[PDB]
């Protein structure tokens, strides 16, 4: 009953953490888009330095490069703050999958070894809550590791088609399958959160 309430409690926290992930991802996409506009504005200024090639654009190359650096490191720290925010979510997500992970370990043990399985709610056995908690966790573990790589390489790259694809992966997150919203509803309707 306490393990049953914690399954319902984890099911609720899984929904809240997903909303926190997509919300922080929106603020991160704004920072990343500003990084892209900073790379494009620097390339645009590089053409202006080649047009007004007087002995005053080679000085403004140093002025613009310093404003570019100070804003780039500020956006890198802002984007790293978004990474840390998504990492705290991922830590809580691993904590939700590991907390559930203990429940069935002692639930199948309390009654010997396979004698009869009591349903925690109306139908879903305790094992089925793992297949959702593990798939949801592995999806965001891959997504977090990808978003880290995109954050590092976005500032280093200069290719336009690569910058667009970098922003593309960040906006719509790939590793989180589209069916993840349905698997969440299949568990929220089971635990009693979603209205009957």
């Amino acid at each position: 009953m306490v393990s049953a309430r914690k399954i319902k409690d984890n099911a609720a926290d899984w929904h809240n953490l997903i909303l926190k992930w997509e919300t922080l991802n929106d603020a991160g996409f704004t920072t990343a888009n500003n990084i892209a506009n900073l790379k494009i504005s620097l390339l645009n200024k590089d053409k202006i330095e080649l047009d007004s090639s007087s002995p005053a654009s080679k000085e403004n190359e140093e002025k613009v490069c310093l404003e570019y650096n100070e804003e780039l490191e500020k956006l890198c720290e802002e984007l790293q703050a978004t990474l840390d925010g998504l990492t705290k979510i991922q830590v809580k997500m691993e904590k939700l999958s590991s907390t559930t992970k203990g429940i069935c370990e002692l639930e199948n043990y309390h009654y010997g070894e396979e004698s009869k399985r009591p349903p925690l709610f109306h139908t879903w056995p305790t094992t089925h809550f793992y297949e959702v908690s593990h798939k949801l966790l592995e999806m965001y573990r891959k997504e977090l590791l990808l978003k880290r790589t995109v954050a590092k390489e976005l500032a280093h790259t200069g290719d336009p088609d690569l910058t667009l694809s970098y922003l593309s992966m960040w906006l719509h997150q790939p590793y989180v399958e589209s069916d993840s919203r349905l698997h969440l509803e299949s568990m929220l309707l089971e635990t009693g959160h979603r209205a009957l």
Partner: protein
């Protein structure tokens, strides 16, 4: 008949222009929803094109990332069909607005044709101090019925360019979409409802 055979027409107009006022509110609330939808269509077009150009790439950062090039493409198309389905919902709103006005105006014109020979040619053309002439009331409803029907055709045909799949064509969708509005009579439905604002509250 009534003590004045024109009262049946004035009552039809007093009930028709407030309906046109509601339909213009839905017509504009749908066109505003189409500005970011077409912007997201041009946005996904740029992403899809750049991603397809980079099918030959060998990025060192792309290591230990399986099916990433494959999933991104599928994920872009899913988000694209969502924008297309929402644009189809907005066309349904613009079509419903067109069918509403094209039906109310036809019913008001049927009421007029019942008493066309009994009201008199002088009572229709004669205006009041604050209400325009009943002839201009009907002719303005004819211009409004034209504005919605002539715009809905261009709205649907221009939004049929998605069938070409041309990444360059769908990138200029918001550029040509705003051309349909500015080229039409943008200040027409709100301007006709202004001259009749005194006739409604009688």
């Amino acid at each position: 008949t009534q003590d004045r055979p024109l009262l049946a027409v004035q009552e039809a107009l007093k009930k028709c222009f407030p309906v046109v006022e509601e339909q213009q509110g839905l017509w504009q609330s749908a066109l505003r929803d189409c500005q970011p939808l077409l912007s997201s269509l041009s946005n996904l077009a740029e992403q899809l094109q750049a991603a397809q150009n980079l099918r030959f790439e060998d990025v060192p950062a792309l290591r230990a990332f399986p099916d990433l090039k494959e999933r991104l493409r599928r994920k872009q198309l899913v988000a694209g069909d969502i924008v297309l389905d929402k644009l189809g919902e907005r066309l349904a709103i613009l079509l419903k607005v067109r069918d509403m006005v094209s039906s109310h105006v036809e019913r008001v014109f049927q009421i007029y044709e019942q008493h066309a020979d009994t009201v008199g040619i002088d009572a229709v053309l004669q205006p009041s101090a604050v209400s325009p002439s009943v002839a201009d009331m009907l002719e303005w409803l004819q211009d409004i019925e034209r504005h919605y029907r002539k715009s809905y055709l261009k709205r649907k045909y221009l939004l049929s360019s998605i069938q070409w799949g041309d990444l360059a064509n769908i990138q200029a969708l918001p550029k040509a979409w705003d051309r349909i509005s500015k080229d039409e009579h943008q200040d027409l439905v709100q301007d006709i409802l202004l001259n009749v604002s005194f006739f409604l509250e009688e």
